[PDB]
Write a protein that binds this ligand. Structure first.
Ligand SMILES: c1ccc(-c2noc(C3CCC3)n2)nc1
Ligand SMILES: c1ccc(-c2noc(C3CCC3)n2)nc1
Ligand SMILES: c1ccc(-c2noc(C3CCC3)n2)nc1
Ligand SMILES: c1ccc(-c2noc(C3CCC3)n2)nc1
Lengths: 193, 193
């Protein structure tokens, strides 16, 4: 007396709910700097996403936000590019508006993809990252070439500035999803206690 | 204006809900013989379980049922024993009644832990499994020693019989959990469509 098709549909609705919940949790962990909680939530979101074979436009945006935050968190930490270069590719392909905040995050990631290699002492890789991404170019390459890690350009387009701008974007995702089914029902149980 | 403690509590309530949902899904996948769906649900349950640091008596039983089904599914197919020997250790330690069905499943696993090695042509391992687990003993060892894989003893304590008895136990878990929060709410959304 069990309809396998309706059971599979109920599991797909639940996977959709779990996906929103885990995106919300990943967003808060990234915002709060809770690295281990972020790693755990990311592993759970990655597994839950395998239970989905067809995704709506909203669900695709959700998984790409998750993948983007994952590469940003791996920034310092089957692809022959660095995590920040992979975050840059996701960022430019997400179905989202290219507003002032989008360009700021984009430019901050482009410079930090070079600066994190210099911070780690791998200047040959910083030049390779620069070549994959890029008069301004000749000056930026001269700065990398001279190992001028703390140049005022790198102090303006800093890692802290990249993280703050990404965190302000995360706040918009967090507010948009804070009302999703699973977190909303969980908060009511906690508030009733 | 956000209370981090109440957010962590809401995430713990949701992890508890996801755990029951994934146990239900793992049970149905095992029952239906949907190997790939089982592997996917197991990976999701394993990740979700990391989001829990304190478990109730009910939650511990749930994760041990999941671990038990996982070893049974890996039966053919950091521990120096076979998957069926690991299932046998979980089975004898779960907080559950040792009724007639429990002994039947236990004895079927003990013989199948030997017979799956013989089926795979590894008779030295079948003897090693036998030594770790065990006049009856001398006769069972003579059967392994003579590579008598299809002896009537092994035909009575068969793999199909072990799977059928485990599946009848899974039906009791499935009925006990079929009413849990997440699957119940998901079925209502599917029924309203
Ligand atoms: C300066 C400012 C913020 C941060 C930061 N925020 O989140 C994270 C990790 C993502 C997993 C935690 N780091 N790091 C440096
Ligand atoms: C190990 C390594 C990488 C990953 C990963 N990559 O992207 C994502 C997103 C969060 C869910 C989609 N996770 N997960 C586990
Ligand atoms: C005889 C009878 C039943 C079965 C069987 N049931 O479930 C499974 C796998 C657990 C993941 C699917 N196999 N195999 C042989
Ligand atoms: C890879 C290998 C093994 C496992 C695993 N072992 O036990 C379990 C149970 C289901 C959730 C608890 N999963 N998961 C993924």
């Amino acid at each position: 007396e069990e309809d396998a098709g309706l059971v599979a549909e109920a599991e797909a609705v639940a996977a959709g709910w779990m996906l929103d919940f885990l995106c919300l949790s990943l967003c808060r962990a990234f915002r709060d700097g809770r690295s281990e909680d972020f790693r755990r939530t990311r592993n759970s979101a990655e597994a839950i996403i395998h239970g989905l074979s067809s995704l709506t436009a909203c669900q695709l945006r959700t998984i790409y936000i998750c993948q983007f935050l994952t590469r940003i968190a791996a920034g310092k930490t089957d692809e022959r590019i660095t995590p920040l270069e992979s975050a840059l590719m996701i960022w430019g392909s997400i179905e989202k508006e290219h507003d002032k905040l989008h360009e700021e995050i984009q430019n901050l990631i482009k410079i930090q993809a070079i600066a994190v290699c210099m911070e780690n002492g791998n200047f040959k890789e910083a030049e390779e990252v620069f070549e994959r991404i890029f008069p301004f170019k000749s000056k930026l390459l001269m700065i990398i070439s001279q190992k001028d890690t703390f140049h005022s350009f790198f102090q303006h387009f800093s890692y802290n500035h990249m993280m703050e701008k990404i965190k302000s974007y995360v706040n918009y995702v967090l507010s948009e999803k804070s009302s999703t089914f699973l977190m909303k029902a969980a908060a009511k149980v906690v508030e009733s206690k």
